[PDB]
Coordinates of C-alpha atoms and ligand atoms in Angstrom, one line a residue:
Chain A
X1 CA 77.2 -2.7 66.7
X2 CA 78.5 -6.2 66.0
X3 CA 79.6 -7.9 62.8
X4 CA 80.0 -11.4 62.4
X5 CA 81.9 -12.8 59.7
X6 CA 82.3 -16.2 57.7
X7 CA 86.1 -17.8 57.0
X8 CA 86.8 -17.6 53.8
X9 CA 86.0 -20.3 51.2
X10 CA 89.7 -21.4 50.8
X11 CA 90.3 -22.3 54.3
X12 CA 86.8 -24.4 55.1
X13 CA 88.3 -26.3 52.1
X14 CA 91.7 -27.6 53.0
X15 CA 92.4 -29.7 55.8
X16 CA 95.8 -27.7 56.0
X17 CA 94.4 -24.4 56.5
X18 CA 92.7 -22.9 59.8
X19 CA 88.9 -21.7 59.4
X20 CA 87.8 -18.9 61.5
X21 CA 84.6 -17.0 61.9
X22 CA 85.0 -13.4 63.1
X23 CA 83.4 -11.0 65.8
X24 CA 83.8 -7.5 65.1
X25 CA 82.5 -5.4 67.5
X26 CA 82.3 -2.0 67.1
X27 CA 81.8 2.2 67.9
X32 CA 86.0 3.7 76.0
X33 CA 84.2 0.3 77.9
X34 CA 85.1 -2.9 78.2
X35 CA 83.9 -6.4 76.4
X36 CA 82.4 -10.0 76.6
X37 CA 82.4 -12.9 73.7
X38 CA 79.9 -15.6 74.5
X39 CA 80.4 -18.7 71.5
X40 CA 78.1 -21.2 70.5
X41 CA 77.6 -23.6 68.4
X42 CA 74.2 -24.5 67.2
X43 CA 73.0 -23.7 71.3
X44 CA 75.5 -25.5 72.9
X45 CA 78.4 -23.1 74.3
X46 CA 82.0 -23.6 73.7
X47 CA 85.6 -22.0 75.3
X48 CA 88.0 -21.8 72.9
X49 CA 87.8 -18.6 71.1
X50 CA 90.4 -16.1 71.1
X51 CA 90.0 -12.7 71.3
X52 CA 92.4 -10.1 69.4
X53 CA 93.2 -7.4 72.1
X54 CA 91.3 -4.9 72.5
X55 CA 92.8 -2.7 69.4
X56 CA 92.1 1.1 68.1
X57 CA 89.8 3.4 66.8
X58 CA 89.4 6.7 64.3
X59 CA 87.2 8.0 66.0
X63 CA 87.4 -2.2 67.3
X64 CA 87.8 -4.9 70.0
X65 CA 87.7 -8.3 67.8
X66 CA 87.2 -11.9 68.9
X67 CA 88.1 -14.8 66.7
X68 CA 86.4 -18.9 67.0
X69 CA 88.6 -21.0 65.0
X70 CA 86.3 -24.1 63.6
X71 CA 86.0 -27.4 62.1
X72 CA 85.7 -28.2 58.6
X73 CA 82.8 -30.4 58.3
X74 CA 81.3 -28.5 61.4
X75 CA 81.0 -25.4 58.5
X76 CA 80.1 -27.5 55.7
X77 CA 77.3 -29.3 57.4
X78 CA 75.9 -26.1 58.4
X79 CA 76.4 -25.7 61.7
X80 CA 75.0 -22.3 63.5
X81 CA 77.5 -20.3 65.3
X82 CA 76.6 -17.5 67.3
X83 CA 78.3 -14.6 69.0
X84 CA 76.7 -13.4 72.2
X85 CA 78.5 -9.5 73.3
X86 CA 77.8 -8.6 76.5
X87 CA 78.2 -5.0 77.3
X88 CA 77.6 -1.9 80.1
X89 CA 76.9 0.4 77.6
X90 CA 74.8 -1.5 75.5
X91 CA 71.1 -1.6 75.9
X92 CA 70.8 -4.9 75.5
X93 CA 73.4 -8.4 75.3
X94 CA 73.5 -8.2 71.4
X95 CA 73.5 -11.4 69.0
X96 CA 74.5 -12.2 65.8
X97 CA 74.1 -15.9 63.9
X98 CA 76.0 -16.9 60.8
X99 CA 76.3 -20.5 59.4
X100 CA 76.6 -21.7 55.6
X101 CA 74.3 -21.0 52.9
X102 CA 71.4 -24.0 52.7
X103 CA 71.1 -26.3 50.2
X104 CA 71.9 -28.8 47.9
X105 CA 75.7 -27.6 46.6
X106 CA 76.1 -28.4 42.8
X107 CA 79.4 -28.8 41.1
X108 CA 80.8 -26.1 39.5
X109 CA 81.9 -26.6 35.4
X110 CA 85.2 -25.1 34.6
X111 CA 85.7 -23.7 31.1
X112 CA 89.0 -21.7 30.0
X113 CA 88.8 -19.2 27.2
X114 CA 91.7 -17.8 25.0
X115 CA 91.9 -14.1 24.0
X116 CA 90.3 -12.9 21.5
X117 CA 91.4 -12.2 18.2
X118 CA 90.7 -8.8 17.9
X119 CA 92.6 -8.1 21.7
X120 CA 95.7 -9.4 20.0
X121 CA 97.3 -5.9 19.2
X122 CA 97.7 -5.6 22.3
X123 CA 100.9 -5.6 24.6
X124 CA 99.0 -7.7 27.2
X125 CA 96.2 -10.3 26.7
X126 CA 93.6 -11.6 28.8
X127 CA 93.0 -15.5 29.7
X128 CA 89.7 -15.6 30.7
X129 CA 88.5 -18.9 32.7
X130 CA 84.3 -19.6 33.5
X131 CA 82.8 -21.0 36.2
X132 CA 79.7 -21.6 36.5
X133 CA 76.5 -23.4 37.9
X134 CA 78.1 -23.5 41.6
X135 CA 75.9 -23.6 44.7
X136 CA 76.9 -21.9 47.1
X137 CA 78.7 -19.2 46.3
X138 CA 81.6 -20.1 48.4
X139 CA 84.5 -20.7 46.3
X140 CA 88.1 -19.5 45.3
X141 CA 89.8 -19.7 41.9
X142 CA 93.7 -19.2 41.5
X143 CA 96.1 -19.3 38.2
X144 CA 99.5 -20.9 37.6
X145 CA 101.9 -22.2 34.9
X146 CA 104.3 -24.5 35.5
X147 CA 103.7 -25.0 39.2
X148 CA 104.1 -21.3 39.5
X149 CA 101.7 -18.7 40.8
X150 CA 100.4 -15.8 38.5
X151 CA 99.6 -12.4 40.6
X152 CA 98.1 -10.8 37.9
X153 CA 94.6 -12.0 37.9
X154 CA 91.1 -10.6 39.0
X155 CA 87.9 -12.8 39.7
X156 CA 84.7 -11.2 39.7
X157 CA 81.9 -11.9 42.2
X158 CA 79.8 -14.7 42.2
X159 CA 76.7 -13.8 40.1
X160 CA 73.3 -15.6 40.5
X161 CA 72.3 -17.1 37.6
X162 CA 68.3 -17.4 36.6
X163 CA 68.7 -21.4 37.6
X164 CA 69.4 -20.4 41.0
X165 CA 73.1 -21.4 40.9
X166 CA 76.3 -19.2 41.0
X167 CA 79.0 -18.4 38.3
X168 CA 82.3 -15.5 38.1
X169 CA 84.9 -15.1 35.6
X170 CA 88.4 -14.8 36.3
X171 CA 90.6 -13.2 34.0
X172 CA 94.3 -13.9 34.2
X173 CA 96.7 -11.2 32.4
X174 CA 99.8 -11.8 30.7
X175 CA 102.0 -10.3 27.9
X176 CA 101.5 -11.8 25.1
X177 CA 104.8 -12.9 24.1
X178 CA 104.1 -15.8 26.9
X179 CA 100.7 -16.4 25.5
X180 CA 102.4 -16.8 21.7
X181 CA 105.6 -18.9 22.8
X182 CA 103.1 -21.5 23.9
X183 CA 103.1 -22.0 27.5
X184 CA 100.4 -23.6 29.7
X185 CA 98.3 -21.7 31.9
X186 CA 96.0 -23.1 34.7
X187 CA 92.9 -22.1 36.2
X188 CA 92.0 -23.8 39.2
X189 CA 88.7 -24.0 41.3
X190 CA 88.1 -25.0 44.7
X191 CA 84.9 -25.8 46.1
X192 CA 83.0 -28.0 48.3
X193 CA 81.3 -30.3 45.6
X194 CA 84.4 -31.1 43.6
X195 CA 86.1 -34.4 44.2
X196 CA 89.1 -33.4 46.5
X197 CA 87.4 -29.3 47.0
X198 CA 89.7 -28.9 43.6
X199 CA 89.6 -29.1 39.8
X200 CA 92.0 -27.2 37.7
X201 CA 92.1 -26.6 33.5
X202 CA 94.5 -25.6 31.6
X203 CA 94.8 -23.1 28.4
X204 CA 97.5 -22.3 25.8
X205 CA 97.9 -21.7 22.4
Chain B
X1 CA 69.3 8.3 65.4
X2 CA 66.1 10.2 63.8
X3 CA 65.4 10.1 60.5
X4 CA 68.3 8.9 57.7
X5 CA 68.9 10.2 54.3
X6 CA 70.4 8.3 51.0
X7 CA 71.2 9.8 47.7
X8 CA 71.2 7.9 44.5
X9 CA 72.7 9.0 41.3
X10 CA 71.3 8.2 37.9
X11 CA 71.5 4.7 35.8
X12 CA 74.4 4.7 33.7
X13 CA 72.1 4.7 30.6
X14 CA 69.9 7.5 31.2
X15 CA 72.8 10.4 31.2
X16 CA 74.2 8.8 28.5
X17 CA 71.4 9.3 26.2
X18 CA 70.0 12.6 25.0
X19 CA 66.5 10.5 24.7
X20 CA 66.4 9.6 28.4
X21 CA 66.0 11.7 31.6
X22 CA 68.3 11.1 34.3
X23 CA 67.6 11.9 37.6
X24 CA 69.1 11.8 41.0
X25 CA 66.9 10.5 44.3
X26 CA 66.9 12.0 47.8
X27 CA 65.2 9.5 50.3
X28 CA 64.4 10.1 53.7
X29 CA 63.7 7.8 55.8
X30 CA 62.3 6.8 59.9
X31 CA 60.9 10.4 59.9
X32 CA 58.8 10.3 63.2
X33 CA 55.3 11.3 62.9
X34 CA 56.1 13.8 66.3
X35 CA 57.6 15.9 63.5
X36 CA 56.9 15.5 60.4
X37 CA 57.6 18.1 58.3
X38 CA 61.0 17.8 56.2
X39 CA 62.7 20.4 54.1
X40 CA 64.6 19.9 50.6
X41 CA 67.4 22.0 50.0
X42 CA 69.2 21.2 46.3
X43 CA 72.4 22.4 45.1
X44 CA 74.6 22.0 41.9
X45 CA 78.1 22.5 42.7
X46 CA 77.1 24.7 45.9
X47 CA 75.0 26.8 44.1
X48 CA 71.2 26.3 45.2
X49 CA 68.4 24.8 42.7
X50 CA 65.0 25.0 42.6
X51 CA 63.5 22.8 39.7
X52 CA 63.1 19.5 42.3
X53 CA 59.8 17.7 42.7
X54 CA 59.2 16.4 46.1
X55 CA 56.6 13.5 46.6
X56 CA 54.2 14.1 49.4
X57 CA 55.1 12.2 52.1
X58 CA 54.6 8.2 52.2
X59 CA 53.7 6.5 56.1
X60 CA 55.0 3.4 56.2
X61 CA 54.0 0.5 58.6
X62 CA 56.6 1.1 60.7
X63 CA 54.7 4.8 61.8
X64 CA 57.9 6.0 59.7
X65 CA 57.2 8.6 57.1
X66 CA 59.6 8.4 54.0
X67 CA 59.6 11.0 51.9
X68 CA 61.4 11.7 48.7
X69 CA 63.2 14.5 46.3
X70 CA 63.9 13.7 42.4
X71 CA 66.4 16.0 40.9
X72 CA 66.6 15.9 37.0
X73 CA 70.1 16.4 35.9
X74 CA 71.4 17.9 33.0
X75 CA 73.0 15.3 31.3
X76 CA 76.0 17.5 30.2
X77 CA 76.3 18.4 33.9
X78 CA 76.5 14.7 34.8
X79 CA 79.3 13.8 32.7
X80 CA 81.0 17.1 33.3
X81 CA 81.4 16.3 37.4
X82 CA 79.2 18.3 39.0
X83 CA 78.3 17.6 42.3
X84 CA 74.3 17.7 43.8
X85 CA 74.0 18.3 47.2
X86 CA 70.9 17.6 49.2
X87 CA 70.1 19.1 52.4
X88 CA 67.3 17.3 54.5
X89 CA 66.4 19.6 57.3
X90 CA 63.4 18.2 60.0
X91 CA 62.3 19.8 63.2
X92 CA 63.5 16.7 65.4
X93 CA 67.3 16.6 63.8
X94 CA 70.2 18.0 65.6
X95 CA 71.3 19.7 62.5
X96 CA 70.0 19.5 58.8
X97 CA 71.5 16.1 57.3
X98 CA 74.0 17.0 54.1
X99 CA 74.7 14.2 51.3
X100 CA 76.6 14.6 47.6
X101 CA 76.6 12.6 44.9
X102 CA 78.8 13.0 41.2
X103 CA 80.1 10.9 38.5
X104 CA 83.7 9.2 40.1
X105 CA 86.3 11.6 39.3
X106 CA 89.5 11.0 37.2
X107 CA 90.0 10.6 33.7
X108 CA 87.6 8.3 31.4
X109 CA 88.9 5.6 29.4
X110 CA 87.5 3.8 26.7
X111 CA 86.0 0.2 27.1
X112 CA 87.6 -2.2 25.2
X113 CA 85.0 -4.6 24.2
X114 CA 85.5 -8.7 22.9
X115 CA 83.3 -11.3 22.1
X116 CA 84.0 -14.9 23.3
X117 CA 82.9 -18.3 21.7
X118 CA 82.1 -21.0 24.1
X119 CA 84.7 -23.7 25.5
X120 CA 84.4 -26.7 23.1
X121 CA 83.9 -28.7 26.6
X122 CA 80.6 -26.8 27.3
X123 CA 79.3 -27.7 23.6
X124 CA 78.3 -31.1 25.3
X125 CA 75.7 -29.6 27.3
X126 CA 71.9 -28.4 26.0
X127 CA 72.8 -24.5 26.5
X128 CA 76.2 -22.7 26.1
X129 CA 77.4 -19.4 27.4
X130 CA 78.3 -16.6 24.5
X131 CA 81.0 -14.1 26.4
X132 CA 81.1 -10.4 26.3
X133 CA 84.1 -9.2 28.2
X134 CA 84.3 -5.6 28.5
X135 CA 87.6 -3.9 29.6
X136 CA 89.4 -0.6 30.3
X137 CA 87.0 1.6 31.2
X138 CA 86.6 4.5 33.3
X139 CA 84.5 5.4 35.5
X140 CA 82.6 1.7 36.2
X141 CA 79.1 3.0 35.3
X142 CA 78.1 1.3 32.3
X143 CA 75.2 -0.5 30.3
X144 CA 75.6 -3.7 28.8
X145 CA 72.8 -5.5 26.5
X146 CA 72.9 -8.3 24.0
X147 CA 70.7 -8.9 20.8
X148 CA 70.6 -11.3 18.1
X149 CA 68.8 -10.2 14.9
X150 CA 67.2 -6.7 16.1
X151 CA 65.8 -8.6 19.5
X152 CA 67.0 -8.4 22.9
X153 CA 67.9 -12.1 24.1
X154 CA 66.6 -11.6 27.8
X155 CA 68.7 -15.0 29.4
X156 CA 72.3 -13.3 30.0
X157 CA 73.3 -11.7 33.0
X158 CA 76.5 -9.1 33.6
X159 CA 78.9 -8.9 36.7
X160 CA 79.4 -6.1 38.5
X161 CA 82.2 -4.1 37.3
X162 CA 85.4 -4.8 39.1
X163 CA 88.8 -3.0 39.4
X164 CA 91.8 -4.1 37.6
X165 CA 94.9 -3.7 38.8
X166 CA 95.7 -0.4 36.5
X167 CA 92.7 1.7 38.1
X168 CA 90.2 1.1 35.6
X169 CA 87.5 -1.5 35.4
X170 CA 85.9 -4.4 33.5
X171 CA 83.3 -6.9 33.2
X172 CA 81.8 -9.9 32.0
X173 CA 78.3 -10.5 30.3
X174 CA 77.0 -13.6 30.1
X175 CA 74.8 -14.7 27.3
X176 CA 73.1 -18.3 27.5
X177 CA 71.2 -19.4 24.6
X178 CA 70.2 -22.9 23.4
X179 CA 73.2 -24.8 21.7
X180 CA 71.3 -25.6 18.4
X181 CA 70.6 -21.6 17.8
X182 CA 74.8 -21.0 18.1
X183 CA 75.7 -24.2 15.8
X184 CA 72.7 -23.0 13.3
X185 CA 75.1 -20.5 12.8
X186 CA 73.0 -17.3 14.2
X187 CA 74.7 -13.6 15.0
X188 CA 74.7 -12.5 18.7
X189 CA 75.6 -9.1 19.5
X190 CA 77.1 -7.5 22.7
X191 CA 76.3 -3.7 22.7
X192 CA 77.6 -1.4 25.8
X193 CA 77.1 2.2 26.7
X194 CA 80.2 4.7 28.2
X195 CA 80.5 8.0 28.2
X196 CA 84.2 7.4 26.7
X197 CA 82.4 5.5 23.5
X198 CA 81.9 7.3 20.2
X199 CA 78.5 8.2 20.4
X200 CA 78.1 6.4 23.6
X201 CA 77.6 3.5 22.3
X202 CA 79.8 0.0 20.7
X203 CA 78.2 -3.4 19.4
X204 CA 80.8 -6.4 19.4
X205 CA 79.1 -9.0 17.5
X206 CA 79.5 -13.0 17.5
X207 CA 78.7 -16.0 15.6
X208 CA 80.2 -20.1 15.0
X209 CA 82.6 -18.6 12.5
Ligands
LIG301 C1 84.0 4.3 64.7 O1 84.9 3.6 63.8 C2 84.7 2.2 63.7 C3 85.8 1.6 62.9 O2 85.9 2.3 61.6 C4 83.3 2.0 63.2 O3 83.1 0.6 62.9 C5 82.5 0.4 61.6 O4 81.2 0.0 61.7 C6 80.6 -0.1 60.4 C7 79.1 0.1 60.6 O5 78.8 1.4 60.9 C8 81.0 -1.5 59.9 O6 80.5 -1.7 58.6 C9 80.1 -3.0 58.3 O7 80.9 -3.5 57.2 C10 80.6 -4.9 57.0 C11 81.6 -5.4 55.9 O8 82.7 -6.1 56.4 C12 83.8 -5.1 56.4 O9 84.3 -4.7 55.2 C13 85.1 -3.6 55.3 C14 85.8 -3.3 53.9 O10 85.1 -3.8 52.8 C15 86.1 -3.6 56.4 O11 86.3 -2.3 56.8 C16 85.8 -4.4 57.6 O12 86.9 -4.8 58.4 C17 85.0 -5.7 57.2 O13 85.9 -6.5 56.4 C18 86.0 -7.9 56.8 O14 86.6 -8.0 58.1 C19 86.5 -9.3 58.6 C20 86.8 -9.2 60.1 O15 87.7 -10.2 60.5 C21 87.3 -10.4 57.8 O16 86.9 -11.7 58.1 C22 88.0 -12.6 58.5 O17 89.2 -12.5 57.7 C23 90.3 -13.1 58.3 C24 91.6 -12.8 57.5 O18 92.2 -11.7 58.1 C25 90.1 -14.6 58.2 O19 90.2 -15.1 56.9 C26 88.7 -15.1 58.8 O20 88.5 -16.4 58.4 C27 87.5 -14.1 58.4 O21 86.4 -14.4 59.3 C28 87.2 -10.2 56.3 O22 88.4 -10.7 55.7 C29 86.9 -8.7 55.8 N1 86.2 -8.8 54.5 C30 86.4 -8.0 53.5 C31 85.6 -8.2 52.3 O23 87.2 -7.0 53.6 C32 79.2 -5.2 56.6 O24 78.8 -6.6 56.7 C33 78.2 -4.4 57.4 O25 77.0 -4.2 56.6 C34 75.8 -5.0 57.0 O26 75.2 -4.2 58.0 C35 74.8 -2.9 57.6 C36 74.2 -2.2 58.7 O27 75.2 -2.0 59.7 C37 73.9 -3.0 56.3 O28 73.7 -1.7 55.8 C38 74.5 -3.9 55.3 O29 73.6 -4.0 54.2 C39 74.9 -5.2 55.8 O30 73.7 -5.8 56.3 C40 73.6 -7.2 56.1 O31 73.4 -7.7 54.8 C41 73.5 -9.1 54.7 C42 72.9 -9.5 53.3 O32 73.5 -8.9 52.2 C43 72.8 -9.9 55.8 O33 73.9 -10.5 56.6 C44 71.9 -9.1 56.8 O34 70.7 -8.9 56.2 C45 72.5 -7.7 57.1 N2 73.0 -7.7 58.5 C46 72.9 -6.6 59.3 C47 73.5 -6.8 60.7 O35 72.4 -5.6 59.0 C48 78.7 -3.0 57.9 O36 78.5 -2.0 56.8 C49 82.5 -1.8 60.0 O37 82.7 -3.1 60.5 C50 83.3 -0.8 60.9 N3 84.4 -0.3 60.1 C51 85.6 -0.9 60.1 C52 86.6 -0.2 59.2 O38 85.8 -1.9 60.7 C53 82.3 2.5 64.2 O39 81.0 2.3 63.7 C54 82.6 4.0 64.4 N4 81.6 4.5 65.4 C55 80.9 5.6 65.2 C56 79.9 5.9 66.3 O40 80.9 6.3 64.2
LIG302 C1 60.6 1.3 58.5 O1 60.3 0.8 57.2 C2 61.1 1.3 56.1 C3 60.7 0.5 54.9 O2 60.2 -0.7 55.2 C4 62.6 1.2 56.3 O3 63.3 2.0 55.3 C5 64.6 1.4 54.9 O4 65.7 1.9 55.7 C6 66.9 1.4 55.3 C7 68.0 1.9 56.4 O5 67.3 1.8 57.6 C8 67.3 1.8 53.9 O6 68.5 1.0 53.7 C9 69.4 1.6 52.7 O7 69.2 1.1 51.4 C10 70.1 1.6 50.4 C11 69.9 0.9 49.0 O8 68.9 1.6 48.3 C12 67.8 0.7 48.3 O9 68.1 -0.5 47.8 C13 67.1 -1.5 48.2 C14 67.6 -2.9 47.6 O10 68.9 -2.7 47.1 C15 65.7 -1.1 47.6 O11 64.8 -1.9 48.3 C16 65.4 0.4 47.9 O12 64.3 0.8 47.1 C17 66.6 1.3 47.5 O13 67.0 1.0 46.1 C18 67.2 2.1 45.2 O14 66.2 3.2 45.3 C19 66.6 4.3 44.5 C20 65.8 5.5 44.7 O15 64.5 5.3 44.2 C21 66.7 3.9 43.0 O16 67.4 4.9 42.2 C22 66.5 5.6 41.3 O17 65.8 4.8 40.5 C23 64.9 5.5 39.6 C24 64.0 4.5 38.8 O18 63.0 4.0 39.6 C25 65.7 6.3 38.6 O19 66.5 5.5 37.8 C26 66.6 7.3 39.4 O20 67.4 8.0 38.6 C27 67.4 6.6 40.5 O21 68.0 7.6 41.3 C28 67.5 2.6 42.8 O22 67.2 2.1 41.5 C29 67.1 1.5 43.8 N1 67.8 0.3 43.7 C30 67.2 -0.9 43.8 C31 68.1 -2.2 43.7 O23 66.0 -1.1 43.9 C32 71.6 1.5 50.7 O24 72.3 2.4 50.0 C33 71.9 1.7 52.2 O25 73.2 1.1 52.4 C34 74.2 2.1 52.4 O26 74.2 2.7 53.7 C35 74.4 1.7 54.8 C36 74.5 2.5 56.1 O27 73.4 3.3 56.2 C37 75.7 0.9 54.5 O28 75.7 -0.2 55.5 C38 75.8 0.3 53.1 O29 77.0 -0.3 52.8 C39 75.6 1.5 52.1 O30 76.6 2.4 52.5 C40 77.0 3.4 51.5 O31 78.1 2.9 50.7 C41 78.6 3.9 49.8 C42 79.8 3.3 49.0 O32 79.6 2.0 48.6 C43 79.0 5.2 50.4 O33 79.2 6.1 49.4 C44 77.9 5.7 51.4 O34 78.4 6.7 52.2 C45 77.3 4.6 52.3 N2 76.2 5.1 53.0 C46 76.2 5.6 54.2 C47 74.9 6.1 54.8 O35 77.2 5.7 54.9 C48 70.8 1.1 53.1 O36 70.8 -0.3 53.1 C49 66.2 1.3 53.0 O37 66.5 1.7 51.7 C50 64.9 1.8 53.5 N3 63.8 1.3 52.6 C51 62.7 2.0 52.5 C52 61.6 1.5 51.5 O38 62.5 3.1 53.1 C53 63.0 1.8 57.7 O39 64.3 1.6 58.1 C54 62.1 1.2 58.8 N4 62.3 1.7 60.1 C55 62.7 1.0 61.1 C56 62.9 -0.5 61.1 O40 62.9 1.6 62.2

């Protein structure tokens, strides 16, 4: 079977960063990778040698920005001996209008703060789609020890997730300033960030 | 590929409450009409069971058959670990198909359960979100419900549960309600259901202070 895959939301977002969707083919013959983009065919994929099993031979497309954000179709045509047919397999953006996503941070609670560790807890919601990433800092430095939950579909239609950012306390009661930041494709610049401390 | 078999456990909140029956689903599915006969075999913990109630058999528009097996569970069994095992066995199947289902094993922890006000920035809008975050706990099946003044408010919705970076889980629920009913001073409460709760059971409540 085949398995096509969409880059992730970070890298459509940032001119820097390389966005790639992903054939992975799957289940002792030999393979073809037909690309195209919304019919018309195109030769620059690259496929990742044919690598091993348990018991996958993966091709990658790298693609443009806007091509992804203005919803472009891009299908993977695998040709195959074995196969009863030439599979398929389409994958483009999610349709519709996006809609900013609003950014609230939220401080422990009182009662978690017997704790040796508390939890910085920032919102985001009312996003469309669900494409998105959400990173902490303070001071220009990267936290590790956060988790974000899965976008969530709200009863309006939109998206939200929470992110929680851990940290001893001690940090949280000296004072300093943490930072949520959001990226997504109806902010100004694909970024926002707010900040939290005591 | 013949026919295919999934087994689903319980909902968190029926084995968790004496009141409730919890139940565990067998479901057979693209069951040809060449053969279709299908056996049920049940077993708690390898040792066979007979108390199951199979649903006579449902043709689809596909010409599949689908056919399932309901299991009531003990709900002491549940939360103790044992495993169910059901066999599917059909005359067009190159052996009977085998699946098992349990409560995730390791220790249970208790949630830890906090209430959270909204952002002064979101008091601007119409609506504001009242925050239930629910930590700690093992394993991730849980119920979580919120209720201002003995009635369920129905506009909140909950995340999956998602693994922290210690092995155990958390969540949050969601709770949107009208801006004027939180300034007008109104009690919101967060109640949630795990097995590693007193009594299964822990309201956090929350109001403008
Ligand atoms: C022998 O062994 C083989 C190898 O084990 C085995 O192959 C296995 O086949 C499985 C199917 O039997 C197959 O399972 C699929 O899993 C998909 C999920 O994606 C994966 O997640 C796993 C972990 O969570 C990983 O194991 C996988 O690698 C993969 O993870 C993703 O990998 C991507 C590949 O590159 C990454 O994307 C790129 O990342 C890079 C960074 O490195 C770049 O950033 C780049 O920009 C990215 O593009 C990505 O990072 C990574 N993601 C994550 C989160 O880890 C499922 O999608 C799929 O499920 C769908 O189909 C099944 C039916 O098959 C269906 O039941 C299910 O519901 C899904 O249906 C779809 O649903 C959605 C709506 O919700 C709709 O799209 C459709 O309606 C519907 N579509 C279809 C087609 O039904 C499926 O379960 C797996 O790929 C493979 N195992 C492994 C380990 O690779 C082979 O089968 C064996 N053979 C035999 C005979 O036994
Ligand atoms: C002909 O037409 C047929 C119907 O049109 C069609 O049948 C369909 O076949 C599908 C596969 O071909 C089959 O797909 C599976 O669906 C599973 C999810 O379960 C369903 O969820 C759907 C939406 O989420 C619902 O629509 C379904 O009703 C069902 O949902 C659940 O049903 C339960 C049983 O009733 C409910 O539980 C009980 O509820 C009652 C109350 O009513 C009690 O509370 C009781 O106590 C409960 O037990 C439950 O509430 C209900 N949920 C909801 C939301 O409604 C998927 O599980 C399955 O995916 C998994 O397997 C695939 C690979 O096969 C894999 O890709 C995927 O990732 C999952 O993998 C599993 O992952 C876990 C770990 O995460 C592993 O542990 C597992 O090992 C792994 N599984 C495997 C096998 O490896 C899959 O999508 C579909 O359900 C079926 N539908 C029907 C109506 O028959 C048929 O295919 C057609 N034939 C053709 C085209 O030829």
């Amino acid at each position: 079977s085949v398995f096509l895959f969409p880059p992730k939301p970070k890298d459509t977002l940032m001119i820097s960063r390389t966005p790639e969707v992903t054939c992975v083919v799957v289940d002792d013959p030999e393979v073809k990778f037909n690309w195209y983009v919304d019919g018309v065919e195109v030769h620059n994929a690259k496929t990742k040698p044919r690598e091993e099993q348990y018991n996958r031979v993966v091709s990658v497309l790298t693609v443009l920005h806007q091509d992804w954000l203005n919803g472009k179709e891009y299908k993977c045509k695998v040709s195959n001996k074995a196969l009863p047919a030439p599979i398929e397999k389409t994958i483009s953006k999610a349709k519709g209008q996006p809609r900013e996503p609003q950014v609230y941070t939220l401080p422990p609670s009182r009662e978690e703060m017997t704790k040796n560790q508390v939890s910085l807890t920032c919102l985001v919601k009312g996003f469309y789609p669900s494409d998105i990433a959400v990173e902490w800092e303070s001071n220009g430095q990267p936290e590790n020890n956060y988790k974000t939950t899965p976008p969530v579909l709200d009863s309006d239609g939109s998206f939200f997730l929470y992110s929680k950012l851990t940290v001893d306390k001690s940090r949280w009661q000296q004072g300093n300033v943490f930072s949520c930041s959001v990226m997504h494709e109806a902010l100004h610049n694909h970024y926002t960030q707010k900040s939290l401390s005591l």
